[PDB]
Design a protein around this ligand. Structure first.
Ligand SMILES: *[C@@H]1O[C@H](CO[C@@H]2O[C@@H](C)[C@@H](O)[C@@H](O)[C@@H]2O)[C@@H](O[C@@H]2O[C@H](CO)[C@@H](O[C@@H]3O[C@H](CO[C@H]4O[C@H](CO)[C@@H](O)[C@H](O)[C@@H]4O)[C@@H](O)[C@H](O[C@H]4O[C@H](CO)[C@@H](O)[C@H](O)[C@@H]4O)[C@@H]3O)[C@H](O)[C@H]2NC(C)=O)[C@H](O)[C@H]1NC(C)=O
Ligand SMILES: CCCCCCCC/C=C\CCCCCCCC(=O)OC[C@H](COP(=O)(O)OCC[N+](C)(C)C)OC(=O)CCCCCCC/C=C\CCCCCCCC
Ligand SMILES: CCCCCCCC/C=C\CCCCCCCC(=O)OC[C@H](COP(=O)(O)OCC[N+](C)(C)C)OC(=O)CCCCCCC/C=C\CCCCCCCC
Ligand SMILES: CCCCCCCC/C=C\CCCCCCCC(=O)OC[C@H](COP(=O)(O)OCC[N+](C)(C)C)OC(=O)CCCCCCC/C=C\CCCCCCCC
Ligand SMILES: CCCCCCCC/C=C\CCCCCCCC(=O)OC[C@H](COP(=O)(O)OCC[N+](C)(C)C)OC(=O)CCCCCCC/C=C\CCCCCCCC
Ligand SMILES: CCCCCCCC/C=C\CCCCCCCC(=O)OC[C@H](COP(=O)(O)OCC[N+](C)(C)C)OC(=O)CCCCCCC/C=C\CCCCCCCC
Ligand SMILES: CCCCCCCC/C=C\CCCCCCCC(=O)OC[C@H](COP(=O)(O)OCC[N+](C)(C)C)OC(=O)CCCCCCC/C=C\CCCCCCCC
Ligand SMILES: CCCCCCCC/C=C\CCCCCCCC(=O)OC[C@H](COP(=O)(O)OCC[N+](C)(C)C)OC(=O)CCCCCCC/C=C\CCCCCCCC
Ligand SMILES: CCCCCCCC/C=C\CCCCCCCC(=O)OC[C@H](COP(=O)(O)OCC[N+](C)(C)C)OC(=O)CCCCCCC/C=C\CCCCCCCC
Ligand SMILES: *[C@@H]1O[C@H](CO)[C@@H](O[C@@H]2O[C@H](CO)[C@@H](O)[C@H](O)[C@H]2NC(C)=O)[C@H](O)[C@H]1NC(C)=O
Ligand SMILES: CC(C)CCC[C@@H](C)[C@H]1CC[C@H]2[C@@H]3CC=C4C[C@@H](O)CC[C@]4(C)[C@H]3CC[C@]12C
Ligand SMILES: CC(C)CCC[C@@H](C)[C@H]1CC[C@H]2[C@@H]3CC=C4C[C@@H](O)CC[C@]4(C)[C@H]3CC[C@]12C
Ligand SMILES: C[C@]12CC/C(=N\OCCN)C[C@@H]1C(=O)C[C@@H]1[C@@H]2CC[C@]2(C)C(=O)CC[C@@H]12
Ligand SMILES: [Mg+2]
Ligand SMILES: [Mg+2]
Ligand SMILES: [Mg+2]
Lengths: 40, 294, 993
């Protein structure tokens, strides 16, 4: 480390947003499944 | 209704209950809220046990440092009359508040101050961010370094005859090493002359192309006579590990300023770990609206 | 429109003569009026047509839906928001636009709610317009001595009018000459059987005399003449309709509950505002700021999604009702049924079917019962003896009525039959269990018939015998059982014949009194085989002399008949009584029939007794018995006219099974009012015009759809398009279910109030950075929260709802202090603490410890301080610290959702446990899933920190609210436990909603 300790000030918000969206999408689907499960 | 629900004399009730009921409810709420408070306090203590005293866990919201100044402008505007003295008092008062911390009387002895190179130098590492060695030592920064803006000669600092000063300062960040641009063929025009590697350059200019002509000679004052910050005053070890620490400063005199006209002056620092933002107008650069109306 | 002169009982000029009548209005009894004179009167007073209703423009009701009690509160909230914005604009530079956003949002909420509610009431109005089928009608008037048929709108007072069986009486006539004319006075006066109209006078009451024809009535059989006495709106039903329109509307119970709810919400809102206005004036702030603080606190305490949530809640139960054919015109009339505690019903057309049907039959010394139900769902009567066959031949032959051409499609009971109601009932019973009467009739040719005579009191006829082995002649006759009994000497027992000894004569007398006491009308049928040796096949028996043996006939059996009640009438009445609803009969029919029908539908439970019954069982005068020993009472209308207010109160206060007979429409209204004077909700169920003033003043009116009148249908609040009476029971069940659900949803939408206000209070008292922003509060109230609150309506019952007693209106409210103590006091407090916890965590991880946050708002807000030192010594610019504050708002909102999970689960059930009821509600599950997906979407989608100011969260923060949620679940679980084990204890009278 030392002088080139640039990583200590970086965060991968991109990957975090990607995952959080994948998860939101999945939860939304599951929801729909439960809602329509019975009317078929 | 109105009278009964307030005081009836058969059931000896007040507001609805008897003497003994208000007590049952008050006692219940006191015990309930007491438990609530104790639980919240316990969950906050475990939090105090989770953080460290010598370093902030997250340092990403403060990666690109800011660029502030000594005068306190309400809308980033410096407007004052050269005749009426009660016009630039708000400026001098602040300026003074800032420089009043670099007094030599404050900086004395071996502890905790140390004499450093009178000429820009390189970084200095006083170890890790621990308590093993006692309170680290910070370099001394003299007032006099700033030549015409020090309040030691002309207390007012310039504002008295149409020649104001502006003390710029780099925002203090823990473990932040300032890095300047290298000598390669790609470098701004301005920066070529006087490339002291050890100095972080600060250079002011005009926002619009027209205003160039109306702004005169930007005279910068600093350590070694250069227009920048010496790398030897970094890094900053934090308040706990370096109380009595002084950050470098750079004075800027706006001599030969056109009278009775609003001038937009943008100052900017250059460097690798320095990046600007179109949303935050204080990240790396800063804007000032000077108008010496007389 | 003098109401007192319209409230009075009808008066008339019936007790007069034909000369006095013609001398008062002016008219030739044999030539009528002249055309010139007729037109002079037509233009002098107005056409014989009722006035149209007072049209209601659509913009008027749209503006109505935009106002009210709840929408008004939101309106004042928007007004306050703009006032605070104006003050901030004229007092400070760079005013934030938070208040202007909140105000336009509240206005939009009110407008959207109004649009939805208005659209529903319009839908019901369209399906309502598809029922008024008005076909023009023309009357037969005699002018200048000639007969002419002119539109009903051209008849005037004084001309001569002739009617014929099948036509409608145009105006109010004074019969001058009749020929066996009968009229149907069921809609106006309520008389089930056809009363004969005669030119002579008989009773002092105009509704009882026979010399007056009435408006909207129909002449069943016969022809008559008459002078028009009353015309236009001045008619009987005209004054009744005008009175109905000139009555007030009232104010349902649900509206009163919402009103008291707003009363409490405003009490605590203005209390917190004036108090924190004094505290701020004591801590230094200026007036200009304190005013904004007062307005802000009073606006944060207003539920905005509650309006939309309550509207959708009420709207959901109405669709379930529309699925079973129960339509409501308004939207709140869906809850009044559940709160009803006294149902005033009508007999003719509501409690009954208004159609004569063969009820009991006598044959083989044995009473037999026949099915008298609409869909024919019952018990047959043993069609295996020869006696029954002979009976079928007697009734099917000695009967002149026949089904109306073209009825080959309708059922056997609902088809049109031309004739008297007795021959029609007999024809239907024979056509029901004996096949086609048309072939049964052509199978035996009728030779000679002697019509019913006023002296003979019998109807007889001879026909050929279809026996291919017997060419003799058959003779059949029907008539009153006494007259026919005096003409027999044999009895067809099980087929063979036997003498008429006194044993069977007494069995016949007891049978006569059995069918008679049942409120039914009995007839006797007999027949005889004419000897072909004394009357050959060629001899013609002209109806002149005694060609048939009047006596020595063979009596086969009696045949009774009466109007039976609708299918689900007894079961529905029993269900209502089970739910603690007092059933009181209010009808204008003969008491001898009303009492029997009462003892048949459940109003007068079998065993209870009236004062006359006791006097008859003991054989003592009626003035000796005590009226307290009689549970049920029959109050006659004539006697009702002479009774004080206290007497009626006592009648309803001491008699549990009351039956008001021979009561006029005005008296019906008086009875409804007598029920309201005490304090109970009333529901009137009717069908004719006499029920219009009763359905209007009642808390809720129920009109029949097929058998109901247009006036009572337009003045009612609920319509039964299928004429099913069990629907009343269904309605009373749904009215309760949606009530307990409204309570659960209100506590849910009120629990989140605390974690949405406390931040600002600590902001002013403790000076810490703002914890909950405005676009987040909006994302919690108007977003996520809506689906769960809407789902709380789909919750099933916990215990039997059709078992508990009706809710007391003076004590058990909708929103009591027990709810406020839970939402505002215990659950909301925990949710607020959880939010503050996540808050401090976010600020502690970035560098601002809890000790340095107290006392920073002045510099934390200042827009020109680009160097704010944190607990570690770092310098933070203005925009950098603001980004963190916004991320703290995002996590605060997510914490709210996390605690709402456990709140929606503890709100699902009020007493029972979750492991008992069960999570069978799919909507609630969907609500939780969607509630979480929306929060993640609002935080992780790019460009939100620009548009809505919500930054992404780091996966370790989302877990700061979990312990508080589990704690909320455990606390409420143990709460809902002591209530069960300890009934009536502290936890019940303190926390049981
Ligand atoms: C850091 O240094 C500051 C300056 O230090 C001075 O210069 C350095 C290089 C050394 O030589 C040091 O020894 C000097 O003191 C220091 O601030 C100074 O503090 C003194 C003490 O209060 C001030 O003296 C007073 O001046 C006023 C009038 O001031 C006028 O000028 C200033 C600008 O300089 C304006 O701001 C004012 O509004 C006025 O226009 C006198 O009225 C006052 O009278 C008092 O003393 C006399 C005897 O002399 C008595 O008879 C009276 O009763 C009063 O008791 C003082 O003479 C001096 O103004 C001030 N300098 C500045 C620039 O403000 C500062 O405190 C140091 N800080 C730290 C943390 O070490
Ligand atoms: C009955 C009702 C059922 C309801 C089911 C709902 C379905 C749930 C759906 C999805 C949840 C799974 C989520 C998994 C996501 C992992 C993704 C991942 O890669 O994430 C890594 C992070 C670590 O982030 P960092 O900051 O360290 O690095 C940041 C580094 N950078 C930013 C530089 C890149 O980790 C994380 O987010 C941790 C993710 C959270 C961990 C899941 C915890 C589960 C909790 C309780 C369940 C226990 C069940 C027990 C079984 C009983 C059976 C009877
Ligand atoms: C019946 C069955 C139904 C099934 C339906 C399934 C639907 C599909 C399900 C999931 C789709 C997943 C899509 C994933 C998109 C990833 C986009 C992404 O990762 O973008 C990140 C970057 C922005 O990063 P930055 O550097 O600016 O960060 C800020 C850095 N700072 C602030 C520090 C400077 O993007 C960019 O640049 C460019 C962004 C361009 C715009 C992309 C639009 C994405 C928006 C919404 C789609 C998500 C919907 C998911 C469903 C939810 C339902 C409620
Ligand atoms: C920065 C700090 C943050 C601060 C955040 C504050 C958040 C505010 C949280 C909650 C607001 C509390 C406001 C008061 C709520 C009271 C509820 C209320 O008014 O509901 C209305 C009920 C009516 O109910 P009903 O319709 O069933 O009646 C039927 C009667 N029938 C049937 C016999 C006719 O009326 C009643 O209950 C009668 C009225 C009783 C009023 C009691 C007043 C108690 C208020 C304060 C006490 C403080 C003392 C502290 C010192 C303790 C000693 C150590
Ligand atoms: C540390 C973290 C703290 C978090 C705190 C917040 C927690 C809140 C969230 C979830 C709480 C779950 C509570 C579990 C309760 C289970 C109760 C249960 O199982 O009682 C069994 C019942 C009773 O049956 P019975 O005897 O009456 O049947 C009679 C049938 N006959 C009539 C045919 C004979 O059976 C039934 O209800 C029928 C089967 C229903 C199965 C339900 C399964 C779904 C459960 C939860 C959904 C997950 C939501 C997650 C939200 C997060 C979104 C991201
Ligand atoms: C059964 C039925 C199922 C239906 C489910 C439907 C789910 C729909 C799922 C996803 C669609 C969501 C909308 C997509 C928005 C895309 C926005 C986008 O792609 O933006 C990309 C660019 C960002 O570019 P940059 O990184 O260079 O910016 C740098 C800026 N610097 C550097 C100055 C800070 O945007 C910009 O610039 C400008 C940003 C414009 C802001 C648009 C956001 C809209 C705001 C509120 C609407 C949300 C309401 C919630 C509805 C919930 C429905 C369930
Ligand atoms: C069924 C489930 C539904 C779920 C949906 C959730 C419901 C949401 C409920 C309430 C949220 C609505 C609140 C509206 C907020 C508007 C904010 C606004 O106008 O801020 C103005 C900002 C100005 O900001 P500044 O001064 O810092 O700019 C400085 C620029 N300098 C410095 C560069 C010059 O301009 C901008 O952001 C420019 C971009 C404009 C963005 C407009 C976004 C509108 C979002 C929602 C409206 C539609 C919602 C309808 C759905 C209803 C659901 C029932
Ligand atoms: C940090 C600690 C974590 C601990 C986790 C423990 C998990 C335990 C897992 C399952 C619990 C056991 C299953 C209980 C089944 C009981 C079945 C039953 O027959 O029940 C009946 C009794 C009620 O009887 P009664 O006499 O009042 O009826 C009166 C009826 N009348 C009114 C008609 C007369 O029911 C009752 O006692 C119900 C009372 C139970 C209250 C305990 C609540 C436990 C808390 C959370 C459970 C975990 C769910 C959430 C998962 C989170 C994952 C992270
Ligand atoms: C972060 C958030 C944390 C929140 C945690 C909250 C924990 C605090 C929970 C309970 C503490 C309150 C205890 C108050 C005890 C004093 C009350 C009292 O003075 O009461 C007197 C009565 C006895 O009078 P009586 O009825 O015979 O007289 C008849 C009189 N007449 C007619 C008016 C009915 O007492 C009775 O009835 C007995 C009723 C006692 C109340 C039981 C309530 C238990 C509720 C929760 C405990 C479960 C905690 C689970 C936490 C798990 C954490 C992981
Ligand atoms: C400061 O600005 C002034 C102009 O305001 C410069 O002086 C002018 O020079 C021109 C010739 O180029 C003369 O015509 C004017 O008369 C001068 N004006 C004054 C007031 O002297 C001056 O050269 C500038 N000085 C510096 C150091 O920039
Ligand atoms: C029924 C109960 C016990 C289920 C509890 C489910 C909880 C643990 C689930 C619901 C939604 C989930 C979050 C959804 C989205 C994200 C963003 C992602 O980038 C990291 C994981 C994270 C933060 C998840 C962590 C786990 C989470 C909070
Ligand atoms: C279940 C409930 C009722 C338990 C509540 C326990 C309360 C009383 C306990 C939980 C954690 C505890 C705190 C833990 C740490 C400290 C720091 C110490 O330097 C002083 C005591 C103090 C401040 C404690 C006071 C008591 C405390 C708040
Ligand atoms: C009080 C509030 C408007 C109302 C509000 N929530 O309204 C939801 C209604 N149920 C909370 C808002 C805040 O906390 C922040 C408040 C804002 C009004 C305007 C305020 C007072 C300001 O000038 C700065 C803080 C702003
Ligand atoms: Mg009727
Ligand atoms: Mg009404
Ligand atoms: Mg709210």
């Amino acid at each position: 480390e030392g002088p080139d300790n640039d990583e200590r000030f970086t965060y991968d918000y991109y990957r975090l947003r990607v995952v959080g969206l994948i998860v939101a999408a999945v939860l939304c689907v599951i929801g729909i499944i439960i809602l329509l499960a019975g009317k078929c | 209704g109105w009278k009964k629900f307030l005081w009836d004399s058969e059931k000896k009730e007040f507001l609805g209950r008897t003497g003994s009921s208000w007590f049952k409810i008050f006692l219940f709420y006191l015990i309930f809220y007491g438990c609530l408070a104790g639980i919240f306090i316990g969950t906050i203590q475990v939090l105090l046990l989770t953080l460290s005293d010598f370093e902030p866990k997250y340092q990403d919201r403060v990666a690109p440092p800011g660029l502030s100044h000594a005068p306190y402008a309400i809308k980033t505007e410096i407007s004052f009359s050269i005749s009426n003295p009660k016009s630039y008092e708000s400026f001098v008062k602040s300026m003074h508040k800032l420089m009043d911390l670099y007094n030599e009387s404050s900086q004395a002895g071996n502890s905790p101050f140390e004499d450093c190179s009178d000429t820009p130098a390189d970084y200095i590492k006083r170890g890790d961010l621990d308590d093993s060695q006692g309170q680290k030592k910070a370099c001394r920064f003299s007032r006099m370094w700033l030549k015409n803006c020090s309040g030691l000669d002309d207390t007012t600092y310039g504002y008295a005859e149409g020649k104001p000063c502006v003390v710029a300062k780099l925002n203090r960040i823990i473990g932040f090493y300032p890095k300047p641009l290298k000598n390669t063929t790609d470098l701004p025009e301005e920066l070529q002359a006087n490339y002291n590697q050890y100095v972080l350059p600060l250079r002011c200019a005009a926002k619009r192309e027209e205003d160039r002509e109306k702004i005169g000679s930007i005279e910068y004052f600093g350590l070694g006579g250069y227009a920048g910050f010496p790398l030897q005053y970094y890094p900053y070890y934090g308040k706990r590990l370096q109380k009595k620490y002084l950050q470098p400063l750079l004075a800027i005199q706006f001599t030969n300023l056109t009278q009775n006209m609003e001038l937009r002056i943008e100052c900017k620092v250059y460097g690798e770990n320095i990046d600007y933002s179109e949303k935050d107008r204080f990240r790396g650069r800063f804007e000032v609206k000077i108008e010496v109306k007389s | 429109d003098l109401d007192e002169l319209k409230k009075e009982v009808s008066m008339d000029d019936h007790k007069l003569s034909l000369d006095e009548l013609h001398n008062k209005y002016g008219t030739d009894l044999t030539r009528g009026l002249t055309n010139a004179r007729a037109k002079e009167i037509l233009a002098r007073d107005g056409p014989n047509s009722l006035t149209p209703p007072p049209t209601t423009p659509e913009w008027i009701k749209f503006c109505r839906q935009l106002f009210g009690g709840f929408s008004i509160l939101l309106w004042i909230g928007a007004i306050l928001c703009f006032l605070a914005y104006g003050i901030q604009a004229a007092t400070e530079d760079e005013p934030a636009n938070d208040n202007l956003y909140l105000g336009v949002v509240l206005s939009t909420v009110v407008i959207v709610t109004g649009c939805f509610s208005y659209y529903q009431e319009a839908k019901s109005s369209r399906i309502m317009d598809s029922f008024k089928n008005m076909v023009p009608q023309q009357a037969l008037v005699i002018r200048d001595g000639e007969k002419s048929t002119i539109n009903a709108e051209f008849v005037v007072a004084g001309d001569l009018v002739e009617v014929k069986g099948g036509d409608r009486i145009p105006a109010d006539l004074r019969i001058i000459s009749a020929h066996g004319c009968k009229v149907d006075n069921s809609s106006l006066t309520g008389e089930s059987e056809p009363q004969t109209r005669s030119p002579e006078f008989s009773s002092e009451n105009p509704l009882e005399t026979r010399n007056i024809a009435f408006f909207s009535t129909n002449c069943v059989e016969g022809t008559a003449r008459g002078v028009v006495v009353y015309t236009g709106d001045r008619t009987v039903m005209g004054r009744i309709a005008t009175l109905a329109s000139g009555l007030e509307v009232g104010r349902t119970p649900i509206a009163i509950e919402i009103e008291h709810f707003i009363h409490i919400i405003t009490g605590v809102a203005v209390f917190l505002g004036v108090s924190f206005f004094i505290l701020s004036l004591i801590l230094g702030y200026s007036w200009l700021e304190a005013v904004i603080f007062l307005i802000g606190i009073i606006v944060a305490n207003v539920p905005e999604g509650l309006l939309a949530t309550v509207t959708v809640c009420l709207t959901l139960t109405a669709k379930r009702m529309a699925r079973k054919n129960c339509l409501v015109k308004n939207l709140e009339a869906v809850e009044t049924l559940g709160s009803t505690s006294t149902i005033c019903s009508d007999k003719t057309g509501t409690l009954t079917q208004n159609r004569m049907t063969v009820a009991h039959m006598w044959f083989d010394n044995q009473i037999h019962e026949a099915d008298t139900t609409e869909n024919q769902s019952g018990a047959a009567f043993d069609k295996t003896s020869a006696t029954w066959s002979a009976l079928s031949r007697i009734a099917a032959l000695c009967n002149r009525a026949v089904f109306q051409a073209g009825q080959d499609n309708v059922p056997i009971l609902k088809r049109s039959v031309a004739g008297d109601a007795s021959e029609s009932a007999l024809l239907k019973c024979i056509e029901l269990c004996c096949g086609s009467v048309q072939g049964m009739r052509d199978r035996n040719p009728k030779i000679v018939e002697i019509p019913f005579n006023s002296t003979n009191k019998y109807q007889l006829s001879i026909h050929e015998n279809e026996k291919s082995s017997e060419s003799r002649y058959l003779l059949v006759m029907k008539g009153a059982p006494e007259r026919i009994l005096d003409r027999c000497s044999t009895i067809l027992l099980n087929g063979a014949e036997e003498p008429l000894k006194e044993d069977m004569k007494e069995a016949f007398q007891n049978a006569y009194l059995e069918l008679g006491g049942l409120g039914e009308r009995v007839l006797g049928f007999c027949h005889f085989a004419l000897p072909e040796d004394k009357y050959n096949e060629g001899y013609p028996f002209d109806a002149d002399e005694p060609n048939f043996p009047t006596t020595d006939l063979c009596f086969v059996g009696l045949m009774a008949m009466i109007d039976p009640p609708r299918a689900a009438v007894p079961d529905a009445v029993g269900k209502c009584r089970s739910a603690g609803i007092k059933v009181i009969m209010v009808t204008g029919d003969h008491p001898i029939t009303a009492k029997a029908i009462a003892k048949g539908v459940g109003i007068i439970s079998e065993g209870n007794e009236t004062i006359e019954d006791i006097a008859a069982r003991l054989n003592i005068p009626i003035g000796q018995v005590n009226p307290r020993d009689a549970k049920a009472c029959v109050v006659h209308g004539s006697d009702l006219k002479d009774l004080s207010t206290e007497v009626l109160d006592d009648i309803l206060h001491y008699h549990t099974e009351i039956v008001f007979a021979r009561t006029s429409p005005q008296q019906k209204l008086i009875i409804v009012e007598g029920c309201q004077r005490q304090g109970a909700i009333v529901a009137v169920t009717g069908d004719g015009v006499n029920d219009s003033p009763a359905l209007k003043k009642a808390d809720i009116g129920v009109a029949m759809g097929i058998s109901g009148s247009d006036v009572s249908k337009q003045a009612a609040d609920m319509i039964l398009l299928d004429d099913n009476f069990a629907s009343i029971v269904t309605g009373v069940e749904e009215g309760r279910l949606i009530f307990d659900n409204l309570k659960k949803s209100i506590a849910y939408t009120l629990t989140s109030n605390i974690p949405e206000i406390t931040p600002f209070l600590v902001f002013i008292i403790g000076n810490v950075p703002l914890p909950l922003g405005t676009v987040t509060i909006l994302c919690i109230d108007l977003g996520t929260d809506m689906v769960p609150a809407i789902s709380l309506a789909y919750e099933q019952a916990e215990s039997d709802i059709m078992k508990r007693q009706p809710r007391n209106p003076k004590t058990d409210k909708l929103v009591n202090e027990r709810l406020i103590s839970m939402a505002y006091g215990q659950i909301g407090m925990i949710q607020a603490l959880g939010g503050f916890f996540s808050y401090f965590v976010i600020l502690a991880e970035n560098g601002f410890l809890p000790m340095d946050l107290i006392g920073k708002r002045v510099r934390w807000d200042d827009r020109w301080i680009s160097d704010v030192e944190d607990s570690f010594g770092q310098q933070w610019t203005y925009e950098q610290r603001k980004i963190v504050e916004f991320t703290c708002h995002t996590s605060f909102f997510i914490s709210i959702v996390v605690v709402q999970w456990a709140d929606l689960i503890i709100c699902k059930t009020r007493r029972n446990s979750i492991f008992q009821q069960g999570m069978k509600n799919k909507i609630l599950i969907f609500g939780l899933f969607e509630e979480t997906a929306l929060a993640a979407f609002l935080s992780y989608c790019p460009g939100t920190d620009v548009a809505l100011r919500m930054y992404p969260l780091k996966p370790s923060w989302w877990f700061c609210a979990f312990p508080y949620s589990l704690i909320i679940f455990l606390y409420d679980e143990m709460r809902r436990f002591i209530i069960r084990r300890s009934p009536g204890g502290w936890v019940e009278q303190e926390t049981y909603y």
